[PDB]
Amino acid sequence: YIMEACDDIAYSVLDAEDIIKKGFASFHDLIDFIQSNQFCKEDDVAKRVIENCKKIHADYAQQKLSPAELNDMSMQMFRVYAIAELVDAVVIAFKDNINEFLNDTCEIKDLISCSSGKNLCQALKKFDSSRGYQHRSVLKLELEGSNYIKGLMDMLWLGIKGRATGDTQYDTPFGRYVYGRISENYRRIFEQENNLPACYKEAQLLADAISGMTDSYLIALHDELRALHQYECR
Amino acid sequence: YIMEACDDIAYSVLDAEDIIKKGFASFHDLIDFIQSNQFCKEDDVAKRVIENCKKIHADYAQQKLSPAELNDMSMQMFRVYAIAELVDAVVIAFKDNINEFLNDTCEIKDLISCSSGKNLCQALKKFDSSRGYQHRSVLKLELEGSNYIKGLMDMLWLGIKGRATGDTQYDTPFGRYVYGRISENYRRIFEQENNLPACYKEAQLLADAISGMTDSYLIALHDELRALHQYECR
Amino acid sequence: SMHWNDLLNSNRRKPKRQQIERDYDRILFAAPTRRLADKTQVFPLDKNDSVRTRLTHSHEVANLSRGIGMRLAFELEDDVFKDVSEDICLKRDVPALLAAIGLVHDMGNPPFGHQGEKAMSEWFTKNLPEHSDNYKDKIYGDFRHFDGNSQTLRLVTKLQGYGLNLTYATLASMIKYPRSSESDSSLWKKHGFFLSEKDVVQDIWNNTGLSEGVRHPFTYIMEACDDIAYSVLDAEDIIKKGFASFHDLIDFIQSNQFCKEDDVAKRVIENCKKIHADYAQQKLSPAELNDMSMQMFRVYAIAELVDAVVIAFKDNINEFLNDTCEIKDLISCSSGKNLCQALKKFDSSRGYQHRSVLKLELEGSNYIKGLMDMLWLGIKGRATGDTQYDTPFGRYVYGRISENYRRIFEQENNLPACYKEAQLLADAISGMTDSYLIALHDELRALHQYECR
Ligand SMILES: [Mg+2]
Ligand SMILES: [Mg+2]
Ligand SMILES: [Mg+2]
Numbered sequence: 044y045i046m047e048a049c050d051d052i053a054y055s056v057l058d059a060e061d062i063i064k065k066g067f068a069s070f071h072d073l074i075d076f077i078q079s080n081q082f083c084k085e086d087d088v089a090k091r092v093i094e095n096c097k098k099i100h101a102d103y104a105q106q107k108l109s110p111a112e113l114n115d116m117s118m119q120m121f122r123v124y125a126i127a128e129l130v131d132a133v134v135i136a137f138k139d140n141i142n143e144f145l146n147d148t149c150e151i152k153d154l155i156s157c158s159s160g161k162n163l164c165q166a167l168k169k170f171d172s173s174r175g176y177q178h179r180s181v182l183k184l185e186l187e188g189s190n191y192i193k194g195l196m197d198m199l200w201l202g203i204k205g206r207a208t209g210d211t212q213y214d215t216p217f218g219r220y221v222y223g224r225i226s227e228n229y230r231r232i233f234e235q236e237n238n239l240p241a242c243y244k245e246a247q248l249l250a251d252a253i254s255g256m257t258d259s260y261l262i263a264l265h266d267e268l269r270a271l272h273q274y275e276c277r
Numbered sequence: 278y279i280m281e282a283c284d285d286i287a288y289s290v291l292d293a294e295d296i297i298k299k300g301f302a303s304f305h306d307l308i309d310f311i312q313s314n315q316f317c318k319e320d321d322v323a324k325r326v327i328e329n330c331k332k333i334h335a336d337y338a339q340q341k342l343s344p345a346e347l348n349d350m351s352m353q354m355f356r357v358y359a360i361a362e363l364v365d366a367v368v369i370a371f372k373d374n375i376n377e378f379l380n381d382t383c384e385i386k387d388l389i390s391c392s393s394g395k396n397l398c399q400a401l402k403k404f405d406s407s408r409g410y411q412h413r414s415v416l417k418l419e420l421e422g423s424n425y426i427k428g429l430m431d432m433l434w435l436g437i438k439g440r441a442t443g444d445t446q447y448d449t450p451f452g453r454y455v456y457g458r459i460s461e462n463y464r465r466i467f468e469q470e471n472n473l474p475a476c477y478k479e480a481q482l483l484a485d486a487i488s489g490m491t492d493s494y495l496i497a498l499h500d501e502l503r504a505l506h507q508y509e510c511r
Numbered sequence: 512s513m514h515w516n517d518l519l520n521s522n523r524r525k526p527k528r529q530q531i532e533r534d535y536d537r538i539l540f541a542a543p544t545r546r547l548a549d550k551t552q553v554f555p556l557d558k559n560d561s562v563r564t565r566l567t568h569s570h571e572v573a574n575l576s577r578g579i580g581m582r583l584a585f586e587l588e589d590d591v592f593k594d595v596s597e598d599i600c601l602k603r604d605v606p607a608l609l610a611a612i613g614l615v616h617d618m619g620n621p622p623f624g625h626q627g628e629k630a631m632s633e634w635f636t637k638n639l640p641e642h643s644d645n646y647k648d649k650i651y652g653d654f655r656h657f658d659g660n661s662q663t664l665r666l667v668t669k670l671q672g673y674g675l676n677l678t679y680a681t682l683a684s685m686i687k688y689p690r691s692s693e694s695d696s697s698l699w700k701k702h703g704f705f706l707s708e709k710d711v712v713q714d715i716w717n718n719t720g721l722s723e724g725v726r727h728p729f730t731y732i733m734e735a736c737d738d739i740a741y742s743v744l745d746a747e748d749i750i751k752k753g754f755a756s757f758h759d760l761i762d763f764i765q766s767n768q769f770c771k772e773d774d775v776a777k778r779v780i781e782n783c784k785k786i787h788a789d790y791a792q793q794k795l796s797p798a799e800l801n802d803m804s805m806q807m808f809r810v811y812a813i814a815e816l817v818d819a820v821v822i823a824f825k826d827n828i829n830e831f832l833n834d835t836c837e838i839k840d841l842i843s844c845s846s847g848k849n850l851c852q853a854l855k856k857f858d859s860s861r862g863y864q865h866r867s868v869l870k871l872e873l874e875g876s877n878y879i880k881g882l883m884d885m886l887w888l889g890i891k892g893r894a895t896g897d898t899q900y901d902t903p904f905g906r907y908v909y910g911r912i913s914e915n916y917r918r919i920f921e922q923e924n925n926l927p928a929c930y931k932e933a934q935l936l937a938d939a940i941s942g943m944t945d946s947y948l949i950a951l952h953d954e955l956r957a958l959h960q961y962e963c964r
Contacts, residue, residue, distance in 0.1 A: 071305055072344045079338075104313075109914050110306045110408070116671075122540070174344075227796050259558035416910045417958070420903040424961035 044144060048133045048154035055167035056125050062175040063118040069110075070100070070117040076170045077163070086162035088128050096121045125163065132160035188258070195265040196253060198272055199225070203249050207233070207241035217275045221268060225252045278378060282367045282388035289401035290359050296409040297352040304334065304351040307404060314400040322362050323397045330355045359397065366394035422492070429499040430487060432506055433459070437483050441467070441475035451509045455502060459486045513832045515595045517720035518727060519604055520679035524668075524714065531604045534681045535573075535611035541675060543618050543666060544569075549944035550622045553745055553862065554752065555871045556945070562748050565617050568740060573613035575736040575817060580606030582821050591828050604680075605729075611677075612684040612733045619662030622945045623875025630879040631657045631940060635933065638887060645929050650706045652692040654933045660687045661705045662941045668711050670915060683719040683727045686712060687734065690723055698724050698837070707926055707934060728824075728831040735820045735841035742854035743812050749862040750805040757787065757804040760857060767853040775815050776850045783808045812850065819847035875945070882952040883940060885959055886912070890936050894920070894928035904962045908955060912939045 062068050074093060083089035099120045103113060136158035143149050151157055155164050175181060202218035203225075205211065213222070222230070225248070233248040256264070296302050308327060317323040333354045337347060370392035377383050389395050409415065436452035437459075439445060447456070456464070459482070467482040490498070521530040528536075538544060548566040549556075556564065563571070583591050584605040592601055621627030635654040639646040653661065664685055667674050677685075688703030690696050691712075704712050716722055749755050761780060770776040786807045790800060823845035830836050842848050862868065889905035890912075892898060900909070909917070912935070920935040943951070 066300065068344050069303055069305070071303070075338060104309060107918075110302050112914060119540075227799060257558070263558055411910060413907075413910050416903075416907040420907045420958055423903040424958070428961055 044151065044154045045133070045137060048137075048158075049130075051153070051155050051164060051168075052126065052129045052133070055164050055171060056122055056129070058171040058175055059167055060118050060122050062171065063114055065180075066111070067178050068170075068174045070096075070114045070121065072174070073118075073121070073170060076173075077166050080162075080166040080169065082162040083166045088132060088160050089163040089166065092121070092124050092128055092163065095124050125167070129155075129158075129160040129164060132158040135159070191262055191265045192253065194269065195261060196249060198265070198268040199249055199252060201272075201275075203245050205245075206248075207244045209241070215275065217272060220271065224264065224268075226255065229255075278385065278388040279367070279371060282371075282392075283364075285387070285389055285398060285402075286360065286363045286367070289398050289405060290356055290363070292405040292409055293401050294352050294356050296405065296412075297348055300345070301412050302404075302408045304330075304348045304355065306408070307352075307355070308334075310404045310407075311397070311400050314396075314403070316396040317400045320396040322366060322394045323400065326355070326358050326362055326397065329358050359401070363389075363392075363394040363398060366392035369393070425496055425499045426487065429495060429502065430483060432499070432502040433483055433486060435506075435509075437479050439479075440482075441478045443475075449509065451506060454505065458498065458502075460489060463489070512829075513720050513725075513728075513834065515592055515832075516599070517718070518680060518683065518729075519595075519599055519608070520683075520718050521599075521604070522679050522718060523676045524679065524682065524711075524718075525673045525676045529600065529603050529607065530678050531611065531680060532607040534675075534677050535607050535614065537675045537677070538611050538615050538618075538667075541618075543942070544614070546942070546944055547618065549946060550620070551624050551871065551875075551945055553624055554748060554868060560752060562752065563744055565620065568744070569614050569617050571744060572616060572733070572736050572740045573610045575740060575813070576609035576613035576733055577606045578817065579732050579736065579821060579824075580609035583824075587821070587825050590825050608680055608684065609729055609732060611681055612729060613736055615663065615667065615681075615685060616687075616733055616737060617659065617663070619664070619666045619941055620659035621657075621662075621879070621941045622943055622948055623879060624872065626872035626875045627879060628657055628659055630876040631883070631937065633876075634880050634883045635937075638883075639929075639933060648927075649693045649695075650927075650930060651933065653702065653705045653930075654937055656692070656702065657937060658688075658701055658703070659941070660685070660701075660703055661708070662937065664704050664708055664712075665938070666942075668708060669919065679715055679718040680727075682711075682715045683721055684729045684733065686715070686721075686727065687730055689716075689721065689726050694723060696724050698839075705934065706930065707924075722834065725834050725836065728828070731831060731838065731841040732820070732824060735824075735845075736817075738840070738842055738851060738855075739813065739816045739820070742851050742858060743809055743816070745858040745862055746854050747805050747809050749858065749865075750801055753798070754865050755857075755861045757783075757801045757808065759861070760805075760808070761787075763857045763860075764850070764853050767849075767856070769849040770853045773849040775819060775847045776853065779808070779811050779815055779850065782811050812854070816842075816845075816847040816851060819845035822846070878949055878952045879940065882948060882955065883936060885952070885955040886936055886939060888959075888962075890932050892932075893935075894931045896928075902962065904959060907958065911951065911955075913942060916942070 059073060063070055063073065074096060077083050077089055077093055080089075096117065100117045103116050103120075108116065133154050136154050137144070140151060140157060143151060155161050198217075199221050202213050202215075202221035205213045206222070212218075229248055229251040232251070233244055237244075239247070253261075293307060297304055297307065308330065311317050311323055311327060314323075330351065334347075334351045337350050337354075342350065367388050370388050371378070374385060374391055377385060385391060389398050433455055436447050436449075436455035439447045440456070446452075463482055463485040466485070467478055471478075473481070487495075519531075523530065544566070547569055548564050550565040552563045552565050552568045554560070554562040556562070584601040588601060592605075595601065621631055623630070632655060635651075635657060639651055639654060641647065641651075641655070664682075667677055667685065668682065686703050688699040688701045689712075690699050690702055691704060691706065691709060692702045693706070694702075719727070721727060746760060750757055750760065761783065764770050764776055764780060767776075783804065787800075787804045790803050790807075795803065820841050823841050824831070827838060827844055830838060838844060842851050886908055889900050889902075889908035892900045893909070899905075916935055916938040919938070920931055924931075926934070940948075
């Protein structure tokens with residue numbers, strides 16, 4: 044629960060910080076979004092954070108700073124205040140509900156929801172979704188990643204499917220090459236004796252191969268396999 | 278005087294609007310810059326514009342708009358208010374000083390400085406210089422333009438110099454080509470017989486040729502001549 | 512002697528959990544810390560290799576230092592920390608302090624590895640001549656012998672009058688060489704801070720009971736952890752990249768003159784040989800067997816070197832707390848000095864002189880020197896008064912410099928104008944990553960064609 048709460052706090056706060064840093068929004072935009080949020084108008088934590096950030100921004104504007112520099116300063120101060128408040132709320136919630144957590148019949152979903160900082164975290168997630176997750180760059184990245192991943196999975200499935208079920212459709216030069224391109228440990232685990240069904244083993248091999256790849260490595264492998272697949276595809 | 282005042286008003290206000298539109302600064306940045314300006318403090322026109330824009334921005338913030346859309350709407354309203362105020366101030370200054378303008382001993386240098394909107398115009402010009410004119414994109418455009426213009430002027434001077442003084446360094450295939458690429462009307466005016474000194478005529482031919490070109494045409498001609506100047510350069 | 516109350520001063524320089532833990536938290540979230548991920552450590556950044564970057568190396572050094580701090584505060588508190596106020600919580604401060612100073616030790620280093628510093632120094636030596644009357648003072652040595660530690664201190668102290676507002680203990684610990692370019696001492700052959708930070712460091716020394724030539728005790732630990740990480744992890748990267756095999760490293764250590772009849776080296780060699788013999792039975796690819804053997808060797812060697820460093824620090828704690836300390840490094844006083852020297856020699860022979868690393872260094876030197884020339888075209892004369900910089904190219908390259916560096920350059924202080932211009936150039940170059948530096952160099956080179964001739 045603590046790890047999940049920290050993950051949610053990191054998402055909500057640093058995604059907003061990155062949104063402001065990239066220029067997709069301003070610090071005043073974030074403050075207005077939090078203030079106008081339905082559940083944060085009366086939320087004590089959100090109001091305290093907003094008031095502290097307003098007080099700090101009242102002083103940061105005096106010094107000669109570029110709009111980007113002022114935005115970064117205010118964003119850093121907001122990050123500090125919001126992270127402190129959310130962490131304190133999460134710790135308080137964990138301490139209060141420790142007996143429930145230590146019991147097997149525990150129905151708590153997440154630590155944020157039972158904490159006093161749930162409204163601020165929800166508002167931050169909404170802001171991140173509206174301003175950052177639907178931006179042109181993020182949407183283009185998601186589309187490119189989907190295309191690359193699905194194409195690479197197709198070309199790898201051409202060489203993975205049938206290896207364990209007994210079929211022979213993989214026994215082609217392209218299939219042999221794409222099998223040899225998979226990391227050796229994944230193949231070693233794939234060629235083992237266990238109760239896993241053969242189709243499950245093939246799917247797990249593909250999932251292990253895809254999951255362990257970085258963006259650059261996945262793109263390079265996809266491009267190379269697409270170049271080499273021209274004859275067999277046609 | 279009226280034309281110059283209108284030119285200055287357009288420069289300041291519309292360059293600020295373009296800065297806001299391109300995302301180099303926000304509407305709040307402009308409002309803070311005007312408010313924090315030393316001269317725009319306790320200035321009636323500046324205060325009036327600031328208060329009107331603040332009220333309109335407060336009204337606009339309720340409507341659910343993207344930060345770019347809110348900035349655009351606020352900047353449009355600011356443009357309307359500022360242009361109206363500056364135009365009214367210019368009209369009042371021109372009407373009050375009409376007798377001096379009709380006198381041969383007029384000492385007025387500009388209409389804006391004699392109006393009540395001089396402080397706002399100065400602040401807007403400073404804002405444009407700080408945020409727009411010194412932006413990296415504008416600096417890169419200026420550097421590229423300087424490079425292109427100076428290179429093209431060198432290559433054209435290679436074919437222009439001496440055509441009127443008598444010295445025949447221009448009579449080369451490259452010189453003849455670059456002379457033929459100049460607009461026919463400018464060449465006709467250059468070849469006319471008058472009392473202008475020959476060096477002045479050549480310099481005026483070059484100035485007329487360079488001034489009449491657009492950006493894309495100048496770049497294309499510069500690239501063409503640079504490609505064709507390779508042998509004669511060395 | 513020196514008291515731990517002053518050395519662990521949790522007061523912050525800016526006039527007004529634990530403060531020292533907050534220091535590590537602030538350092539982790541700093542933008543240059545994230546920028547460290549794009550700076551090469553030794554080897555070039557490939558698309559598949561997991562070679563160390565500056566960020567990964569910094570995190571590894573921080574982890575080693577934090578482990579040392581846990582050992583010091585939880586097991587050797589009586590032997591190390593004597594006469595410490597009950598207000599100071601050692602178990603929360605010492606590990607956090609060591610981790611923070613380990614994570615920040617390479618923040619200000621230029622890109623392209625050690626060749627970055629070397630290229631900056633060579634360019635400054637050439638373009639800031641020592642014979643020229645404009646550059647004769649030892650202060651310009653700050654750039655002729657440019658060091659990443661001084662830039663790191665400058666970043667943490669004068670980049671945001673205060674930057675991250677680190678505690679006095681942290682700032683005192685980050686001063687690797689407690690001397691300036693002007694001050695000449697046989698104890699340290701490198702300067703640890705710039706002239707512009709002379710007032711800051713003097714403040715730090717005032718709040719920590721330190722002085723010129725006197726080094727904070729935890730700086731020895733941080734330097735030892737840095738050396739251990741360098742040697743062991745560079746050897747691991749060499750093995751991983753395929754430039755050498757695990758057996759090659761074992762033979763090199765065994766055939767090393769000093770590592771013969773050395774207890775730590777022999778212990779590590781025997782443990783690794785037994786583990787390799789056990790591993791060889793399992794059917795693994797040669798790369799996989801090399802990786803497993805090198806991982807076990809890394810574990811054993813890091814454990815042995817860390818234990819030796821801890822023992823050396825505990826034994827020499829009284830000398831470290833004395834103002835007349837003559838210790839140059841913690842490794843040389845430990846039992847693992849021979850193993851560290853052999854590992855460094857192995858890395859130099861097989862990794863640092865590999866053709867890929869040499870090509871990376873040459874490319875970095877070319878890029879850095881070209882970009883420094885093009886930036887100097889727009890920087891020189893801005894503070895002295897001469898207006899050769901007022902050209903469209905000069906204005907553009909000045910505008911491409913980070914706004915904070917320009918703001919610091921335009922501030923009025925007692926620094927000489929030439930020093931201010933050189934420091935602006937150094938700050939601009941040091942803060943760039945490899946890819947950003949290459950992109951800016953290509954852009955300026957494309958835009959410099961007309962003004963070049
Ligand atoms: Mg996560
Ligand atoms: Mg005009
Ligand atoms: Mg290091």
